[PDB]
Amino acid sequence: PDYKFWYTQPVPKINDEFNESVNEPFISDNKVEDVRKDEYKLPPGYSWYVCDVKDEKDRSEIYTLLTDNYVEDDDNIFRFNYSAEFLLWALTSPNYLKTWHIGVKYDASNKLIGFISAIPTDICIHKRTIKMAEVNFLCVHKTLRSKRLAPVLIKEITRRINLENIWQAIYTAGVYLPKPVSDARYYHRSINVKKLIEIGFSSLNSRLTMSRAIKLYRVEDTLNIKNMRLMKKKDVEGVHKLLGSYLEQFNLYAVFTKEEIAHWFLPIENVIYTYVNEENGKIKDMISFYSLPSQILGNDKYSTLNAAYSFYNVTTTATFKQLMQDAILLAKRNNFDVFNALEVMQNKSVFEDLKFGEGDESLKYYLYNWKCASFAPAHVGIVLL
Ligand SMILES: C#CCCCCCCCCCCCC(=O)SCCNC(=O)CCNC(=O)[C@H](O)C(C)(C)COP(=O)(O)OP(=O)(O)OC[C@H]1O[C@@H](n2cnc3c(N)ncnc32)[C@H](O)[C@@H]1OP(=O)(O)O
Ligand SMILES: Cc1nn(C)c(C)c1NS(=O)(=O)c1c(Cl)cc(-c2ccnc(N3CCNCC3)c2)cc1Cl
Ligand SMILES: [Cl-]
């Protein structure tokens, strides 16, 4: 590929590799005063729109755009179906900016046909903490693909982020772009076996009959960590200490304030599930996973695959395998069909014994305007939504 757009940007070329001692911007000494004050030009008939995600109607417009036009698997069987409540949660973290929730409307219909978003986060990369933007939910309507709208959305959000004196970003994508700092495969743990077979997500053979498959993935309805319970407001301080200490071992992680811990972990039904083990008023273990269904395209019986995604999990009183076994159980108790995880942090070590199957795609982690050594995904300590 030529990367005609990306090679104009402060990112590594596809052949670039850096020593572990290199950890710095491509372009330093940036000046807010020099940032373009004009919005990037859109093709005739299209206009920028600042979305208010706290307004139900604006939020529903984003929801519809993404439901119909967002990420599909390579075989066009599944399309992500982020809920409206999920989008509210994902986009209104502490110190979010409404003007970083950017839509594009088709003037004649007044309909939203494009979107991109950013939220601010402090990112520790190779022990250096940098104020960054986390870019997500880039989407162009299926009818307008391959018209070079995505670089316009990227350049416009870059401009708006730069106006706030932020010059680095973090982002993930399934597509290969210049140039990942890490690459993490997805793994899947079947919960509702029969449904997964019926929709083609899983397979049988003459050895693995339907009944044998169901027995293989059967789980005992008893927690290894008996007191694991839904997180409450009183647990924010203890989760902040437990998770904050845990994440410092990694090469890439978010540095969460107490306010960010409250936002990202306090439970919201059908959005975010966090469980804690409290001993003597101290949080000693935590499990968390978020809800992200996929629409099943075309299937007669089922419209929705109900998937839980591993978020952040820490144990100090059990083994990591016991903890993730409880995570699977808690997902099953909340009626999820499958439990998905990336090979980040310590996750890969438990996939075999807990009967995860390797998927067929990976998530690439990227930094914008930052050069550093790449690393194996066990050194990644951040999960983006
Ligand atoms: C400081 C501060 C800096 C802030 C900025 C940091 C950089 C942020 C980059 C964006 C990160 C996005 C993270 C994600 O949210 S992930 C989910 C992506 N959402 C989907 O997968 C939904 C379904 N899909 C679509 O909605 C469209 O396919 C897209 C993704 C909008 C792409 O639009 P289309 O019509 O194909 O392509 P056009 O408009 O002709 O643009 C082509 C150029 O674009 C590049 N590109 C494509 N996908 C990308 C992508 N996902 N992220 C970034 N760049 C992408 C591509 O390579 C090429 O450029 P070159 O010529 O190769 O240099
Ligand atoms: C079962 C299923 N349902 N769907 C809808 C799909 C795609 C699958 N197959 S999958 O599990 O193997 C999978 C998964 Cl989960 C995710 C991605 C992917 C692609 C691009 N971008 C992201 N980002 C997520 C983080 N924020 C930025 C966007 C994820 C690709 C694959 Cl292929
Ligand atoms: Cl129990």
Author numbering: 26 to 410
Provide passages from the article that reported this PDB entry.
Using these data, a structure-guided approach was used to identify compounds that can overcome resistance mediated by the G386E substitution, exploiting the differential binding mode of DDD85646. Analysis of the PvNMT[G386E] structure with either IMP-1002 or DDD85646 bound demonstrated that the positions of all three amino acids (E386, Y211, and H213) were influenced by the binding mode of the inhibitor. A preferred conformation (rotamer Y211a) was adopted in both the unliganded PvNMT[WT] and [G386E] enzymes, and, on binding of DDD85646 to PvNMT[WT], Y211 moved only slightly to rotamer Y211b when DDD85646 was bound to PvNMT[G386E]. Therefore, we measured the IC50 of DDD85646 with PvNMT[WT] and [G386E] enzyme and its EC50 with Pf3D7 [WT] and [G386E] parasite clones; compared with IMP-1002, the ratio of G386E/WT for DDD85646 was between 1 and 1.7 in both assays (CPM assay, IC50 ratio = 1.4 ± 0.35; growth assay, EC50 ratio = 1 ± 0.1), strengthening the hypothesis that DDD85646 binding is unaffected by G386E. This was supported by thermal shift data with DDD85646 that confirmed the difference in stabilization (ΔΔTm) between PvNMT[WT] and PvNMT[G386E] was only 3°C, significantly less than the >7.0°C in favor of WT observed for IMP-1002. Overall the minimal disruption of Y211 and H213 by DDD85646 binding results in the conserved affinity and binding mode for both WT and G386E variants, and these data together with minimally perturbed IC50, EC50, and thermal stability lead us to conclude that DDD85646 can break resistance in NMT[G386E] parasites. In combination with the shift in EC50, IC50, and thermal stability, the SPR data clearly show that DDD85646 can overcome resistance mediated by G386E. DDD85646 is insensitive to the resistance mechanism generated in response to IMP-1002 treatment, but at a cost of lower selectivity over HsNMT, because Y211 needs to move from the “in” Y211c rotamer occupancy, which provides improved selectivity over HsNMT (Yu et al., 2012), to the “out” Y211d rotamer, leaving room for G386E.
